[PDB]
Design a protein around this nucleic acid. Sequence first.
RNA 1: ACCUCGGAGCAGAACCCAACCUCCGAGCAGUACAUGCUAAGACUUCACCAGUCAAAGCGAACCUCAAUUGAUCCA
Lengths: 95, 287, 152, 110, 54, 52
Amino acid sequence: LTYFSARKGKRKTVKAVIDRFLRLHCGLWVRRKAGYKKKLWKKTPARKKRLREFVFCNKTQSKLLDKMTTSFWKRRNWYVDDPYQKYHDRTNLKV
Amino acid sequence: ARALDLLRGLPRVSLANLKPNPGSKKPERRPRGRRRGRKCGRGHKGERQRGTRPRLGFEGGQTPFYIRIPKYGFNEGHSFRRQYKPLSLNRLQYLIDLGRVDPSQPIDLTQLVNGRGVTIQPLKRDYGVQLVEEGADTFTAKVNIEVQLASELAIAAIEKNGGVVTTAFYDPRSLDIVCKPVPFFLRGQPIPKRMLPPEELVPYYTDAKNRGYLADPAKFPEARLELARKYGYILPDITKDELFKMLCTRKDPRQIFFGLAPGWVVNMADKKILKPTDENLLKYYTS
Amino acid sequence: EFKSIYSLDKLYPESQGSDTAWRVPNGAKQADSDIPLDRLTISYCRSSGKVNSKAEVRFHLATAEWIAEPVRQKIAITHKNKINRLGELILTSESSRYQFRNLADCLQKIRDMITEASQTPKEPTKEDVKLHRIRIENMNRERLRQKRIHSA
Amino acid sequence: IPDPPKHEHYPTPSGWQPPRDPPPNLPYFVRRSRMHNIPVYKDITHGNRQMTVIRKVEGDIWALQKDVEDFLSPLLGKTPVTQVNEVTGTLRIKGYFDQELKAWLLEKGF
Amino acid sequence: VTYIFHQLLDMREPVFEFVRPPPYHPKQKRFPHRQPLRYLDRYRDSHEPTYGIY
Amino acid sequence: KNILVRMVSEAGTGFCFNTKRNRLREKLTLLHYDPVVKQRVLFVEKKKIRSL
RNA sequence: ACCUCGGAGCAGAACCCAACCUCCGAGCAGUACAUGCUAAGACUUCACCAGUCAAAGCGAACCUCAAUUGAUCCA
Ligand SMILES: [Mg+2]
Ligand SMILES: [Mg+2]
Ligand SMILES: [Mg+2]
Ligand SMILES: [Mg+2]
Ligand SMILES: [Mg+2]
Ligand SMILES: [Mg+2]
Ligand SMILES: [Mg+2]
């Protein structure tokens, strides 16, 4: 994944991860379901409703994506009207 | 202390007596010996022991997880979105109470940074400070503050104690200049004129409800009265105040600093200020 | 001192006064709907920190002269479930954790009650979720009323 | 960092309060951070270990340990788990007690 | 009933309310795998923005 | 044999939905719920794109 | 000769369980067009991806079938 670049000696990031996933500052990664816009004419409304969901990733997948991205994508952002602003923090979680 | 009394004995400290704190220096593990050699932690043959293991994200040939998922514009224009550092009312009250930024003078971005209540990053796309209502109650400050964004509850809370809040705009260059003025002064450049807000921020900063710095002051009292009526706590008249002159300082647009004007040059050594006559320069720096 | 071509005086030549943005329109904005805050007792007391402060506004409804006589009686009739022993109307708010917003909601409740009881020709929309059972019970109750003589 | 101004009545809004003069007659002493706060900090190493750190202790620290145990035993129902560091005069406590310890030390006048 | 409480029992009238048990949610996971984005909404107390140290 | 067609409403314009239709049968006019007007309106088959 | 999916046995009574093992099948079809929208709590083909069920609620009347299938990019 180019741990060391030939120009700066820096770690690089896989841009497919950035194009496909969103990282909340707590450490959670959000993805879209596969096939959520393919052949909707053979799918039931419940299946399509569960396909339209934004879902969380595994612990293993989260660590893999953290390895595949650089620390720039893990900083705390303060956008103006972020629809995911309230999801960047964890509440009432115990160990 | 008993420690120096102990040291009164205890032969003198030299370079032959030094020793690290236990736990700081973890011991290195070398591949020599029976336990750590003969395979050196690599296991038996295959790609593992030979080091030619496939790249991270590869899953043996099956379509990987990070490619199976459909693309979605989560971080589409992330480098162009604007960001604002939150400044809470309770943090502002704490700053005021601890001898930091002084309410007796207008409070703006440079004052907040010099008091070190906020750290603004012009790179990483921060457009200033946004005011939030975390400490709306138990907030007795009486300040004249200038921010870039503010909630209506924060506006009500500040206006409620006899203070004035206004909402201004800064382009990234003026943001850097106003956050770190001293490096700009050492740069040697004449003070530029602050730029107007973008076409989408124009209706925000020309709206008297957000206390925008480009809105007509003929609608400020009615909006202040409306906020006071919505939230109780009748609106105080600040014209009869002893600090009304200080509260009135408004810091004209295209003027990044208070007493300074665009086009001036600051000479920090041999302290003085240079003014650009040849009135073509005046026309450029005023228009 | 410095003024650019975007100075406020040139942007809005009519509003050139020094105190034009701070003068209070108390002379004209003195209608009967101002809800004099002095005559409302507002208490801020519920054990916050469940982090939701409580707004409690109470006022003697009978002696509320700022509300007209017929709307006052209509409010007393239609909100009799909120009148304490001493006759004062009680309104509370829990929507937010800011006492500012809680008081705002209480004041909005007061204004809505006043301006709803003022306009009596409002048409009550029918509901059949909770009161259908009550009305059927009342009908089958009134069905049992038939002698000739009784008093008190 | 400027010295905080002389307020007429304490505690100030936001709950700040200066240390009292003269210093309390105690076997130990707890200095204030450079910004005049109580040096009690939350700490989390793993995803589980919640601890509090009382950092700028000066004098003997075993008396402070005794006082902290006597203060937090009723609140916990058991004696608190504690580590003493004399060389770096800090006191580590298992669990989150930052606000309780800040109020307690303020009441003792540090 | 309210005037009975007014002048007969010379007491302040009590009012009751039929409440229900709080909804059951499982123990919150650090990684809620395959749960919708609204999973995090079942564990908040106040639905208002928070800014911790800022 | 059976063809998937697109059905477009008249009122609540812009809302379409795909349904399976036998090829030999005439074009469909159906009552269907239109969420942008929150009531059942007519839908007329237009622009068939599928063959199953 | 086979490569994907489902039913039965082997595999007798929670689950799982191989075989170039024994046998059947599938790559559709038919009917409404609320086959609308949301949302607790669960199951899960031993991972993941996929897949499955569903209270309450908002609206509106007062679903059969076993498999019947194809990710991403891109168009
Ligand atoms: Mg050997
Ligand atoms: Mg070998
Ligand atoms: Mg091998
Ligand atoms: Mg292949
Ligand atoms: Mg730590
Ligand atoms: Mg499973
Ligand atoms: Mg239902």
